[PDB]
Design a protein around this motif. Sequence first.
Motif, PDB file in Angstrom:
ATOM      1  N   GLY A 108      59.907  64.423  46.665  1.00 11.62           N
ATOM      2  CA  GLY A 108      59.302  65.310  47.648  1.00 11.62           C
ATOM      3  C   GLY A 108      60.147  65.466  48.893  1.00 11.62           C
ATOM      4  N   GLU A 109      59.595  66.161  49.881  1.00 12.93           N
ATOM      5  CA  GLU A 109      60.308  66.439  51.128  1.00 12.93           C
ATOM      6  C   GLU A 109      60.120  65.296  52.109  1.00 12.93           C
ATOM      7  OE1 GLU A 109      58.499  70.221  52.303  1.00 12.93           O
ATOM      8  OE2 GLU A 109      59.878  71.259  50.923  1.00 12.93           O
TER       9      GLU A 109
ATOM     10  N   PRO B  53      56.407  65.965  42.903  1.00 17.40           N
ATOM     11  CA  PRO B  53      55.554  67.047  43.421  1.00 17.40           C
ATOM     12  C   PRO B  53      55.291  68.128  42.378  1.00 17.40           C
ATOM     13  CG  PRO B  53      57.272  66.545  44.985  1.00 17.40           C
ATOM     14  CD  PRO B  53      57.585  65.744  43.762  1.00 17.40           C
TER      15      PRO B  53
ATOM     16  N   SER C  67      52.297  62.050  56.257  1.00 21.22           N
ATOM     17  CA  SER C  67      51.527  60.962  55.660  1.00 21.22           C
ATOM     18  C   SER C  67      51.334  59.781  56.615  1.00 21.22           C
ATOM     19  CB  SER C  67      52.197  60.497  54.362  1.00 21.22           C
ATOM     20  OG  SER C  67      51.423  59.521  53.694  1.00 21.22           O
TER      21      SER C  67
ATOM     22  N   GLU D  99      56.910  65.044  54.073  1.00 20.49           N
ATOM     23  CA  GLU D  99      55.753  64.378  53.477  1.00 20.49           C
ATOM     24  C   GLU D  99      55.512  63.003  54.096  1.00 20.49           C
ATOM     25  OE1 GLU D  99      54.744  66.705  51.345  1.00 20.49           O
ATOM     26  OE2 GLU D  99      52.939  65.862  50.424  1.00 20.49           O
ATOM     27  N   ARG D 100      56.572  62.207  54.227  1.00 14.39           N
ATOM     28  CA  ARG D 100      56.465  60.848  54.770  1.00 14.39           C
ATOM     29  C   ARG D 100      56.063  60.832  56.245  1.00 14.39           C
ATOM     30  NH1 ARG D 100      59.908  57.425  51.426  1.00 14.39           N
ATOM     31  NH2 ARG D 100      59.748  58.267  49.295  1.00 14.39           N
TER      32      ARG D 100
ATOM     33  N   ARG E  92      45.412  64.478  44.241  1.00 11.25           N
ATOM     34  CA  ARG E  92      46.131  65.503  45.004  1.00 11.25           C
ATOM     35  C   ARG E  92      45.208  66.327  45.903  1.00 11.25           C
ATOM     36  NH1 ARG E  92      50.873  66.587  42.787  1.00 11.25           N
ATOM     37  NH2 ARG E  92      52.250  64.817  42.307  1.00 11.25           N
TER      38      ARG E  92
ATOM     39  N   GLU F 167      61.800  69.453  55.770  1.00 12.32           N
ATOM     40  CA  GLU F 167      61.535  70.123  54.483  1.00 12.32           C
ATOM     41  C   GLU F 167      62.805  70.451  53.699  1.00 12.32           C
ATOM     42  OE1 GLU F 167      58.782  72.183  56.962  1.00 12.32           O
ATOM     43  OE2 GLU F 167      60.482  71.265  58.006  1.00 12.32           O
TER      44      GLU F 167
ATOM     45  N   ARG G 267      44.948  64.278  54.535  1.00  9.78           N
ATOM     46  CA  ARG G 267      46.128  64.584  55.353  1.00  9.78           C
ATOM     47  C   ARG G 267      45.862  65.730  56.334  1.00  9.78           C
TER      48      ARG G 267
END
Lengths: 259, 236, 260, 266, 252, 260
Positions: E96-97, A148, E104, E100-101, A96, E144, A103
Motif C-alpha cells: 500500500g501507500e 490493497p 492509520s 496509509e500508515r 475493509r 501516496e 479510519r
Amino acid sequence: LYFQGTIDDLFIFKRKLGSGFGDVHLVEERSSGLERVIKTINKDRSQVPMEQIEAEIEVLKSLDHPNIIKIFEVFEDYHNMYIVMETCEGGELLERIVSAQARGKALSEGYVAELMKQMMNALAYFHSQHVVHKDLKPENILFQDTSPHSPIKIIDFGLAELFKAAGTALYMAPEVFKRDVTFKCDIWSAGVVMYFLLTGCLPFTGTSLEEVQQKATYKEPNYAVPLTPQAVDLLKQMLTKDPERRPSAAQVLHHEWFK
Amino acid sequence: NLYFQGTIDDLFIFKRKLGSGAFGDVHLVEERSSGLERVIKTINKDRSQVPMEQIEAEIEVLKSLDHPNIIKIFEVFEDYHNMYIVMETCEGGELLERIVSAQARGKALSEGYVAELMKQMMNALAYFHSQHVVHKDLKPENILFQDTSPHSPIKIIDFGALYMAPEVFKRDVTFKCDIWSAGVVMYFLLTGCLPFTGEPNYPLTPQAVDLLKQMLTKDPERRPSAAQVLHHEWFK
Amino acid sequence: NLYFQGTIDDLFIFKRKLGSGAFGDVHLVEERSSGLERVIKTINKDRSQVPMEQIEAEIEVLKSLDHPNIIKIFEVFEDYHNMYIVMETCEGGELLERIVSAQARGKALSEGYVAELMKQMMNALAYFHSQHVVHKDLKPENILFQDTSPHSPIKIIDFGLAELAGTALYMAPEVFKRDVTFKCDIWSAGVVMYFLLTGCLPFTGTSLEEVQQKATYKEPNYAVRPLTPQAVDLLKQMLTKDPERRPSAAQVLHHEWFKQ
Amino acid sequence: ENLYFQGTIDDLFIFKRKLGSGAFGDVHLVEERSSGLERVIKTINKDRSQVPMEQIEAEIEVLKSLDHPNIIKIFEVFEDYHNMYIVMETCEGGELLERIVSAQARGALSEGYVAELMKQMMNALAYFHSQHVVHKDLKPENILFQDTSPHSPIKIIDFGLAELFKAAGTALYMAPEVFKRDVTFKCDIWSAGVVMYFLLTGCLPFTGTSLEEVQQKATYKEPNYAVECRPLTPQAVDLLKQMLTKDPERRPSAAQVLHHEWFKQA
Amino acid sequence: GRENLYFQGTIDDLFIFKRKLGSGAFGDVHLVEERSSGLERVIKTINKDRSQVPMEQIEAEIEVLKSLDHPNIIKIFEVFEDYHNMYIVMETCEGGELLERIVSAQARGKALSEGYVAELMKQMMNALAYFHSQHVVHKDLKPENILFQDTSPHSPIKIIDFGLAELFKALYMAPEVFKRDVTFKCDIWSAGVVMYFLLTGCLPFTGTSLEEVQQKATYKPLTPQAVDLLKQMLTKDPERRPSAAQVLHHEW
Amino acid sequence: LYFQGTIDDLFIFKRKLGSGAFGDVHLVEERSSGLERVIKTINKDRSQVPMEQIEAEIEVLKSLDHPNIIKIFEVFEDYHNMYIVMETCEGGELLERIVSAQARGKALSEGYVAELMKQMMNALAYFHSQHVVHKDLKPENILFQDTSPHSPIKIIDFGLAELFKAGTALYMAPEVFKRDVTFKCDIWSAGVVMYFLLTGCLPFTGTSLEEVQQKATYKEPNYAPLTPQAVDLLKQMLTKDPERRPSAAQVLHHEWFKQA
Ligand SMILES: Nc1ncnc2c1ncn2[C@@H]1O[C@@H](COP(=O)(O)OP(=O)(O)NP(=O)(O)O)[C@@H](O)[C@H]1O
Ligand SMILES: Nc1ncnc2c1ncn2[C@@H]1O[C@@H](COP(=O)(O)OP(=O)(O)NP(=O)(O)O)[C@@H](O)[C@H]1O
Ligand SMILES: Nc1ncnc2c1ncn2[C@@H]1O[C@@H](COP(=O)(O)OP(=O)(O)NP(=O)(O)O)[C@@H](O)[C@H]1O
Ligand SMILES: Nc1ncnc2c1ncn2[C@@H]1O[C@@H](COP(=O)(O)OP(=O)(O)NP(=O)(O)O)[C@@H](O)[C@H]1O
Ligand SMILES: Nc1ncnc2c1ncn2[C@@H]1O[C@@H](COP(=O)(O)OP(=O)(O)NP(=O)(O)O)[C@@H](O)[C@H]1O
Ligand SMILES: Nc1ncnc2c1ncn2[C@@H]1O[C@@H](COP(=O)(O)OP(=O)(O)NP(=O)(O)O)[C@@H](O)[C@H]1O
Ligand SMILES: [Ca+2]
Ligand SMILES: [Ca+2]
Ligand SMILES: [Ca+2]
Ligand SMILES: [Mg+2]
Ligand SMILES: [Mg+2]
Ligand SMILES: [Mg+2]
Ligand SMILES: [Mg+2]
Ligand SMILES: [Mg+2]
Ligand SMILES: [Mg+2]
C-alpha cells in the motif's frame, strides 16, 4: 474410491477457525505440506437425504472461477463430510469496511466498482451453473492476500435450509422471508454489500428481526447521509423489492456505473 | 476407512505407463490438486492369492518406511478392482544402468564410489529390518537414483533367481535373505559380473573380498545382520 | 575475526564423501540452517609445507573469484585441524565424461560445441588471471557442468594449491623447469581443446620423462578427426613451446576461430 | 494496432550461447533481462522470405497457438528490420537421436518404451493436424526431451518453414509424395513411421549414397523387415507397414494410428 | 514505429489486464498478468494524444526512468507502445501507500517512532541522491507516491509515479515551483514536507485553496536535531536548501 | 570454529529494527543465500555475569525447536559482540492486534484468544521442560509469523536482562519482585497477556513502579463481559502464590480451552 486411513492421516488439523453445521479448520496436507482449509459437515443434522447434499456439494466443487473459492477434494466417513479448500490470507471483506469507518474515511467508487465487478462476474458464473448462494455478505467474501488490490473470493455457500436472528436478516431479500429462494436474492444481497461499501451504512437497520424485514419490505433506503447518480441508479435496481423486476447478474454488469 | 467423492482419475492424471508387472501397472502421474508429480503402482486385486487383510497390513507398514534411501509411499487408495500406491518420483533411474554403463565403457566402478552406495543401502536395510520388514527382491533394477546427478542418493523400490539366497529355495525367508541379495549386488557393482551364473571366482582389495564372503556366507544363521555389516572396516 | 558457536558438524550435515586427495577430502553436505546443498573441500592443515599465512591468502583470493564459469566459494571456515571451503554444487559431472562418452558413441564433438566451451573456459581464465591467479591444474576432470542439459555451462574447479602422467599430460614445458606463470594455464587449455576436438591427448607416453620431452619438443598430430585451419592455428598458438610467445587468454578470445 | 517494444532484442535478451545453425537460422540460449528467465530464440533472416511477411506472421501465429504437452511452446515472436526472433521454452533432454545413438553403442530401445514415445508423438500430431498444421520435417533431431529423466516427455520442435523461407537427413524421413510436391498431413505419418522404425531397429528403413537412391527406395522398396525387425512383435511390424504405406491416400491418420493393436499390447 | 522492436500481436497477447487500480491525468494503471510467465506486473498506460510535446522527449524521459535501478525506486522492466498508447511495465508493490500508515496512526491516536521515520527517510533520501546523480527530478514526491514493497511492518519503500504532468494536458510544492522554477531541490522540499507529516501527523502548510497554501508555503513533541533537519529541508530559497547527499550526512 | 572474514562478510545489514540495553536488532540479508534473517547483537562489555553463563543460556535457547518459539539458526561471535541469527516474522507484534481492537471499540473474541493462548501455553510447556524461564513475556515479545488473520505466533526475546548491566513491571509476577524467579512467573505473565487480550486493559496499572508492584502483590484485578471459565483460568494464572499457581501443562487442561 476408499483411502487407507482417516482424515488425520491425510491432514494435520492445525486450528479451528470457526463452527456452525460443523467446524472450519486451518489444515496442512501431510503428503505435500500444503496449507488448506477444511469445512467439516456433520451428517447428523442432515434433515434432507444425503443424495441431494452430495450432489449440491458436487456442483459447488465444479465452480471454477477466479472469484469463487476453490474446493479441491471432498472426503467422507461414517459421521461427517470434509470439504477441502484453498486458503485465503487477506481476511473478510468486512474488515475493509470496518477499517474504513474507523479510519474516518470512505471507500472509493472506483475501488468498489472493481470489487463489485469481480463479485457480479462470480454471481453470473455460478448462476449459469444453477447455484444460488443464499447467504452473500461481507464476512462471506474473502481477500486472497493482504495487498490493497487483492482479488475477491466468495465462500460459505448456503446449505443451511438443509440442516434446520436480527443480524441474520440484514442481507436477506424481502421475498426470502416468504421462503421464495431464487438466484435473484443473490442480486439483492450483492446490492446490500454495494450500499454498505459505498456509504459505510446498511440500508435497512434495526433492533429486531421484524424491524429489519418490515423495513426492507416497504421502505426505500436513505441515500442522502454522498454517491454519484449512476451508482444510486444501479443500487435502486439491485434493491428492487420485487424479485421479478430485479435484474440478473449479467444485466448488472452492463450498467453504466462500471464505466 | 475414508471415502473420497470421485475416482482415481478424479485425483490423478495418468501420464505414462512406466511398466507392467505380474500383478499391476506402474504409471507416471500428476496429482490434480497440487500439480505435483507422483508415480502409482496399481495392484490388481484379482491376482491376490491371500485374503486382502494380509496384503493391506503388509503395505501400511511399508508406507511407514521413512528413510532417505527408501522410496517414500505418500498414500494408498482402493476401488473394487485395484489398490493404488502413490509414491515419490525418482529421476535417476535404475542402478543397473550404472553397471551396464561402465561395462560398455571399459573401466569398472571405484571402490570408494561403491562403498558410499553400499553404505546407503545397508543403512536402509538396517532400518526396515528393525521395522520387521524383509524386502525379498533386492537387485540393481530395484534400486533407483533419486536424480541424474553423479553423486545422487539411491532409493530402494519394489518391496516384494540370480539374487536369491540358498535358504529361500527351501522356503526359509528371513531378514538375512536381503543381506545375501545385497552381497550379490555388491559383487556385481565391483567386478562387473554376477557371482553365480548359469564358490564364486574372485581384483578387489583384501578388506573388500572379506565382506563379500561374510555377506554371501551360505548359512543364514552365520550370516551377519545389516547393523553389523555397517561396522566393517571396508567402509573405513 | 568471527567465531561460530559450535563445529562444522553443528553447521553442516556431511552426507557423502565425493573423493579424497593429499590435502584432504571432498564431501557433499547440507547446511543445517537452510537445508541447502553444498560441497566442502576439507584441507588438513597438517600437510602444509609453507607458513599457513600464505595458504589463507591464496584461498581468500580464490573466494573473491566471482564469474559464471568459476566455482562459487561461499565461505571458508577453520578448525584447529582443518580448513573448510564451502562451495556451490554442480550436477555435472566432469567434462571428461563428455569426452569419454563421445569415444564410446564414436561421434566426434563438433567445433561449434567446443567453441562455446572454450569461450566460457577462456573467459574464466581471462578473469582469474586478471586477479593474479594461476590455476596450475586445468584438465577435463577439473571442469564440471552446472547441470545435466546438453547446453549446460561449465564451472572450473580445483584451483591448484601445490603448497601442501595424469596431470602431467596437461603440463606446460616450462612448468617442468619450475616456471609457473599464467601462460601455463593457456597451454593446459590448449591441451583440453585438442583433447575435446580429437579424442586424443597430444603428448602420449609410458613414462613421465617420455611425456615431458614430447611436450617440450614434439609437434602434435593435427591430422587424425578433421580440424578446420583456424582451429589448428589456435591450437598451435596455445601450444607454443615458449611461454613468452604463447598468447594471453584475452588474446585467445579474439581469435578468428571463435567467429565460427 | 501494431505493438512495439521500446529498444532492440539486445535490450530485451542477453544472448548467452549459440546452440546451433538450423535450416532457417541460428538458435541461442537466452536470458530475459527482466525476469531473468531462460529461453531459446530462433533467429530467422527475413532475407530468405519467399512469401509476404504478413503471411509468415500469420503462419507463425498458428504455430504459437499450438498448446500441447508434446509440442514446443513458443512464448512470443519479435522482429527487427532484418530478423524474426522466435522466443520459446528451453528443453534440457535434449535430442531424441542421442538416445538412439546411445542404444546403438550399448548394443535396441525396447518396444514398451518406444510405444510410450509414439503415443506422445501421435497425440501431438493428431492435435496439430486438427489445427491444420503440417510439420513436414519430423526426425529424431527435431524431437527433444524436456529433461534427462529416463521417463522424460518429448517436445516436437523445428516445424517446417520451407514454403516461407528458402537436409540430407530430412531426405531420409521424407514421404514418397512430398518428393512429387504433394505435401499433406499424411507426410507427417510417414516421417513418424520412419522415426518409429529407427527407434525399434536402430536402423533407417531407406538408405543410399545419393539423394536419388534414397528417393527411389522410399518410393518403391519394401524395408528390410526380415533382417532388421527380428526382435520385434508382428503387431509392431504391421503398424510400421501401415505408416510406411507408399500411397498417402491409403496411409492412416494420426487418430487411426492411435487405435492400432500395438499400443494396446504393451 | 520509431525503429523500435516489432512484436507479432497486441498488448492483449502479452498481458492479461486483471484490475484497474486508478485513472490518471493521462492514462490508466492496471494490475496485470504476463501470459508467458504468469508473473504479476503493474502497467501504467499513457495516452499519446494527451501529450503537449514531441513523442521523442517522452520516450527519452521514460528511458532514463527505466534505467533507475535502486532498492527504493520502482523497477520498470520494459516499455511497449502502439498507435494510441505507451505501456510502462513495472514491478508490483503489495504494501500500500505510505499515506496509509500515517492515516492509520492518527486514527489509532499514537505517533510513529523517530527511529522508524528516520529509517524510512534514509531509504527515501538514498533514492533521491541516486536519481539526482542521474539528472532526474521527481517533481511530485508525496506519501501516496511512496509504496511499501510488502505488508510487513519493516517493509522497504519504493518511490513511484515520477512526475510527467508537464509533458501532457500544492501541499508538497516548493515555493519556487509556483514561479516555474523546477529544480532537483524541489524534491528535497517535498521530502521535508513528507517527513514533517510523518513526525507530526499534520501537514506543515495546511489550507483550503491554492492561493491560501502557496502564500503560506512562501512565508511561514519532535526532538531538537529533528527540527534542525526539517528547517534545512524546508528552506524557502532552493539555493540555501541542502542536497540529498547532504541531508544524509545530518546527525539525526 | 573460525570464519575467514567478519560478520559483514556473511550478512548484509539492511535495516535497524530497534535497540536494547545490551545491543541492537537488525533485519538482515544472508550473503550466500540471499535469505532474510534478523540479527540480535549482544554487546559483550555490558555483561555482569561471566561470559560462559551467557554463552550457555543462549545455547539452550537455540535448542528450542517449536512451532511457536522463534527459531534461532546460529550464533556468531567476535571480540566486541555476540550475534544471534533468527528467522524473520512478518506479522508484527501481538500488541498491535490489541491496540487495533481498542481503536475499533470492538473486542477480541474468546475463540480467537483461546487459540492464541493454546499456542502460547504449548510453547511454555515445551521450553519449561527444557528448563528455560522466559522472564519477560508480553505482547511486544510475541510476533505473528505472517500478516494473515490466522497467523501462528512466535515468542521472541527470551529474557537475559539479569546477565547484563515501569512497563515490564506490568507483567511481573509478585515473587519476581522478591527475587524469586521460577517457571511460574511465566504463567503469571501469560495470565496478564490473556487479561490484556480479553478486556483491553492491563490488570494492574500504576503511575509508578511502586504502585504496580503493590497492586500486583495484594490487589485483585477488576474482573467486571468474560465467561465464568475465562475468569476462572485468569484467577488461577494470576494466583499470588507461585506455589499454588498452575503449570503450563496444567493450564492446557482447563475447561476454557474446551468450549471456545
Ligand atoms: N478458505 C478459507 N480460507 C481462509 N479463511 C477461511 C476460509 N473459509 C473460512 N475462513 C475463515 O474462517 C471462518 C470462521 O468462522 P465462520 O466460517 O463464520 O463459521 P461458520 O462455519 O461459517 N458458521 P456461521 O458463523 O454460523 O456462518 C471465518 O473467520 C473465515 O474468514
Ligand atoms: N518411484 C519411482 N520413481 C520413478 N520411477 C519408478 C518408480 N518406481 C518404478 N519406477 C520405474 O518404473 C519401472 C517399470 O516397471 P517395473 O516392473 O518396476 O520394471 P520392469 O523392468 O517392468 N520389471 P517387471 O515389471 O517386474 O518385469 C521401472 O522402469 C522403474 O525404473
Ligand atoms: N562443486 C562440486 N560439485 C559437485 N562435485 C564436485 C565439486 N567439486 C568436486 N566435485 C567432485 O569430487 C571430486 C573428488 O575428488 P577427485 O578430484 O576425483 O580426486 P583428486 O582430484 O585426485 N583429489 P581431491 O578431488 O581434491 O580429493 C570429483 O569427483 C569431482 O567431480
Ligand atoms: N527449445 C530448445 N531447447 C533446447 N535446445 C534446443 C531448442 N531448440 C533447438 N535446440 C537445439 O539447438 C539445435 C541446433 O540446431 P542444428 O541444426 O543442430 O545446428 P548445427 O550447429 O548446424 N548442428 P548440425 O546440423 O548437426 O551440424 C539443436 O542442437 C537442438 O538440440
Ligand atoms: N507498481 C505498483 N504496484 C502496486 N500498486 C501500484 C503501483 N503503481 C501504482 N499503484 C497503485 O495504483 C494507483 C492508482 O492510481 P494513482 O497513482 O492513485 O493515480 P495516478 O494514475 O498516479 N494519477 P493521479 O490520480 O493524479 O494520482 C494507486 O492505487 C497506487 O497505490
Ligand atoms: N525475529 C524477528 N522478526 C521480525 N521482527 C523482529 C524479530 N525480532 C525482533 N523483531 C522486531 O524488532 C524489535 C525492535 O527492537 P526491540 O525488540 O524493542 O528490542 P529489545 O531487544 O526488546 N530491547 P528493549 O525493547 O529496549 O527492551 C521489535 O520491533 C520487534 O517487532
Ligand atoms: Ca492429495
Ligand atoms: Ca549460512
Ligand atoms: Ca517478457
Ligand atoms: Mg460464514
Ligand atoms: Mg521390479
Ligand atoms: Mg580435482
Ligand atoms: Mg533441427
Ligand atoms: Mg500518483
Ligand atoms: Mg523485547
